[PDB]
Amino acid sequence: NITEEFYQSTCSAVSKGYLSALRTGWYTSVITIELSNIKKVKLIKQELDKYKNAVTELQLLMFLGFLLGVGSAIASGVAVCKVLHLEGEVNKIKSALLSTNKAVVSLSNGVSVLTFKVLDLKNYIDKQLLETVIEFQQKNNRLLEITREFSVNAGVTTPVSTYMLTNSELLSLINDMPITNDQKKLMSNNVQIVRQQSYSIMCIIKEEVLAYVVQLPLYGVIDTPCWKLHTSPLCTTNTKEGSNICLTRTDRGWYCDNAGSVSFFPQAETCKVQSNRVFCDTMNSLTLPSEVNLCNVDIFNPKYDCKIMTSKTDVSSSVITSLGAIVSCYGKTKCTASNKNRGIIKTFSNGCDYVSNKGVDTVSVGNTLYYVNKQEGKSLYVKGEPIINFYDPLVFPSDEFDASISQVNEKINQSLAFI
Amino acid sequence: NITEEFYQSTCSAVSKGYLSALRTGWYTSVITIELSNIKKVKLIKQELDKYKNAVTELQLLMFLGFLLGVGSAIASGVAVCKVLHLEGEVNKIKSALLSTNKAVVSLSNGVSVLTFKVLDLKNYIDKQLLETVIEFQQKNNRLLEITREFSVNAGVTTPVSTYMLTNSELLSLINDMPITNDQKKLMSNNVQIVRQQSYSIMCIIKEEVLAYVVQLPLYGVIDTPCWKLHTSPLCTTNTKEGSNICLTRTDRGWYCDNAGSVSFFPQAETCKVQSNRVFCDTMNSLTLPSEVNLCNVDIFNPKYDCKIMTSKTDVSSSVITSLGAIVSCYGKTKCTASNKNRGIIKTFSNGCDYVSNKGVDTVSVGNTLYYVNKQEGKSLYVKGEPIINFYDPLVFPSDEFDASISQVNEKINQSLAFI
Amino acid sequence: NITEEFYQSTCSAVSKGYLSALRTGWYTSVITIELSNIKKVKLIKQELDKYKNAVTELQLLMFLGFLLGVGSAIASGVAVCKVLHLEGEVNKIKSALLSTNKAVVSLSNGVSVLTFKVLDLKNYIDKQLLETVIEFQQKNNRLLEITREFSVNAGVTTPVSTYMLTNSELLSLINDMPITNDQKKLMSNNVQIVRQQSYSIMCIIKEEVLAYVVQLPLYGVIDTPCWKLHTSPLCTTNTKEGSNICLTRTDRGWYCDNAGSVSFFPQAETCKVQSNRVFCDTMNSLTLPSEVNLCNVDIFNPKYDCKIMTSKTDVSSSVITSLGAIVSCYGKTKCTASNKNRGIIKTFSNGCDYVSNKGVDTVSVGNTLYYVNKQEGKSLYVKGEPIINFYDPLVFPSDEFDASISQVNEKINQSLAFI
């Protein structure tokens, strides 16, 4: 299942065995709540003034990450909202949602949307008010809460709450939206992840109807191989401080096979791991040639120019990986690995080393205690000469950030042909 | 209204037609809740123990962004809190808020604050408890909720909720605070934005009074012209990879005319757009000469030194603008623009191009789907030779970040006079 | 108590007088809720269907910062969760929590955990349901709220709410967990800070038991001296623009004495100040030699290589410190300090200056108004020649980021021996 390789020569590790789930698109749906135009008994009198005020307010209401592009997260959802402001467009919805709650309406600008009437307060208030109290206070409370979410979030919320869309409604919404059966089961078995990648956009109150758009994720890439790249500073370990040179692979992040290429997510926080399934958003990704994976096995390969940064700053630190820990120990720092019940079992030397989570519960670098992940899986240590040893410190470029193996090699050549 | 120009020569676009609303200052107000010192009937017995415990806990309680300065967001509000800890200062408030709820108190350190008694539980509990239940459970619930917000936020909350300050109270607070009529209407028509720029600071419980300060935004700059600058990487498109050079304008962000100068907001996320009104915070801004706008029309102009970064990293991406999309297509990437109902309508060539939101619903760069904003407005394409063609790649500085047109020109000159 | 020194020569200031409180480790505890397997009267009928649905969903559910390492924040807590999925492990807990609510269970993998039964709905529903309503609706509400938190957060919450763990339970939990009496009082007097550094991890529903792990902070470093370093750009102030050179100390952040070394926190936002106590997390820290403090008194000292960045970008800004304000005024910018009731009292000249919070309420740099902190304490102005005057602009490296005094001196020497 989940496996991990560590590369001694580049101070990096790769975790594989993951399956993709990439948000590639959005499904937009119009959620409606029907309202009443009103203008043990006392229990409703105070719950009815709660109502009037909610409507009152609802109306008053209306390393490599820098290489990423810039999207507009809710542009699709807002595009649907602008349509519902057209005249007769709200009444078209109101009409279709007459004898049923779930209906697909064709909107006037060539947009077919799944519309859902999730609460019928109009039918409730006009039939009952003008046991019963129990239903009012509960249906009303949902209205108050949807209102609260929208007012402290300026009409745009995420993750989409159970108030905006109940588990019942969401699951049904998922089942009725037209996607593959794989997508349907994936979404159904991960509704909280779905909720976190969703948007709720307050749209309109007009003609006794409250409407908001829910923007749900389309996962157009499913079950392709994914892998995470961890990198840590690789430094020489000479005696005199300040005489050392350092190199870090800057291409750390999530990598997923996708449509003949590889999706790269430089900010691994924009991805959510569930056992062995990785949920990412393609908005936070670059599209690279699959040759990028060649940088793990051979960082000097002629097909892809592996990206690195350089410095003279040899501080110690650790990177906790999926199945172990990379340790970059430099200078006078104390770095150890421990077992929970027996204590220190490995003291690290200067340089960059690695330990697996088998038998190890924590790692210590200086004054920093890291707990390691205790997921089961196999680790492989790939011995190799640390590539930083291949450079003369006297002509090593000591502050490169957006750089690569070739860019450094050219800078060096310019400095050598020089002498 | 909203208009947009794209500049082919610098791979950038400018959206104009916006009106400012800058938070320049803070208004601090002391909000008080009066408490009781106590020590169908059973409904109050359990709601009264809710009360005692809330009081219990309330007492237990007490690119260019790096160029920004560093403020202390609630320094003004906390400065008022320290005054209420002085002896007799709480009783001064308690005294003025006797026969009315809304009063301006002069605090002992030369601070005139609008004070508001938003809930009188002391008068309620001592007159009623020592129909009725309905009022208790509702007034009490507000107390419990204010308490919850403060305990999970360590006494400082934002956005300021409806519990801290009701729509009623906030609107009235806005109307009574002494600012211009323009500010009053601006704040009143945008109370949720106001709420998001506000702070609630738990201050004190002493002498049967709960006091917290609400820190509200002063908008001292209103209705001046604003514009957003979008930039994207400009790269040469030579055949052999790694032989290319790239240049990005780094001065992207919001720009607002302000007091003879221009306020620049390098992190466009610190600004909130409402139709054509832009809410920014001057804490997240630099003050530049208005000559900075010369960089859009002529990036080689002699009055301002336009800021850029350089690299050799030609990855594709898109920037979704206000009225269209900038596309930076490089290497073997597939980049398209589509209409919702007809599909691909433009395939982009290598280099940096632009498409408007008229007729276009989405843009695709590699595996990344961007929806474009569907706001109405006019786009203008300004043809020009891409300036990256004006540089010899053999003497081009390939990793500059905090740089400019002149700094690069000097670095080149140093490399040319050399040879 | 709190004191501050400003260094004119390096445009930096140091705030001392603080006491540490570092999260060094985690305490994990298993919190259990016992459930019923069921399948004025009507009040319970609707509150009982609330129950069934909550269980339904609960089951469906299951500058220098770049130098930091990367941890896994809840690796310890999740490691305990995996144990409770073993067979008989839930029943071991269920067994010990029979005749009492608070018990220490030895888990099968050599982990002794404090286990807490915080709500007994099983005993309630099976004894009462199969005055009374008041208790049900209140105990049930807690269940619904724990459920809501977990569903919109995918089973991991922070800060840990009063629903996950009441003030009562938390205080008792703190008292029973085996730490020093200093830690116990520190945690007890700061429970909201404790809550913010805590994690709640949804673990399991099996055999009529709901279990989640609460991950609480261990403060292994307490009451050591702490100090905050503020830095601001130091630039020459020549007439012609673009002819100036700039230098910024990049080592700003929190510094705490710790186990013979100094813990450095480059992102001062990962630290929370309470009067004179500083709460930090060692995960967001580097371990440095105590010699790093030598950079404040003598930035040219031979024991530690003080870190700086260089540029040609002389923009004005201010840094609000603990007891005053650093002002970096350059070019044509208007920079002032004011008193609340008398207005402008100091106009700053070009260069980097400082003002204390005694008599000063605000500082203005360009269009940016900063309020200063009004904490009492002594400020000391240490006069010195600004070190940027010691460099020839013609051989000054104008874009260094990850650099230091020596690295710049070497780059200069390479440029001088050259000529």
Ligand SMILES: Cc1ccc(O)c(Cn2c(NC3CCN(CCN)CC3)nc3c(C)cccc32)n1
């Ligand atoms: C906030 C901030 C401010 C200023 C700045 O530059 C950067 C970008 N940047 C640079 N600078 C690059 C590369 C070095 N120089 C190349 C000629 N020596 C100059 C341009 N080195 C960096 C390292 C090491 C880590 C993270 C970011 C880095 N970030």
